[PDB]
Design a protein around this ligand. Structure first.
Ligand SMILES: [Cl-]
Ligand SMILES: [Cl-]
Length: 118
């Protein structure tokens, strides 16, 4: 899989060139970064909030564009929200690692497929 940033921050290799989606990706990196350093019930819920908002938006753009790989992508999103929606603070190290991995892998292995398509 792709390199997990340490510190856990977005960098330009994750860019999709759709400004609001890129800004959304930057806030999910920051949401996980904050849960790592302050593994609190508010930060977990903020993470769930910013990830649900991003997924609704990215799906709206894929549907508007009639992007034909939207259906497996939506399933990826649904499963992730179900997993982080089911967590409670403090999130254990396995699940923090899962989240760090999932974001990196999701943007470069799946969100990258819509580059120039939305
Ligand atoms: Cl890379
Ligand atoms: Cl095209």
């Amino acid at each position: 899989g792709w390199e997990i940033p340490e510190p856990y921050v977005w960098d330009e290799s994750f860019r999709v060139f759709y400004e609001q989606l890129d800004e959304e990706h930057k806030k999910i990196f920051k949401g996980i970064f904050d849960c790592i350093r302050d593994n609190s019930a508010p930060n977990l819920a903020t993470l769930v909030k910013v990830t649900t908002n991003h997924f609704t938006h990215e799906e709206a753009m894929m549907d508007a564009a009639k992007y034909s790989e939207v259906v497996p992508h939506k399933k990826m999103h649904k499963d992730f929200l179900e997993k982080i929606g089911g967590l409670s603070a403090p999130v254990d190290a396995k699940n923090v690692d899962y989240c760090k991995e999932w974001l990196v892998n999701h943007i470069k292995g799946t969100d990258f497929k819509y580059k120039g398509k939305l």
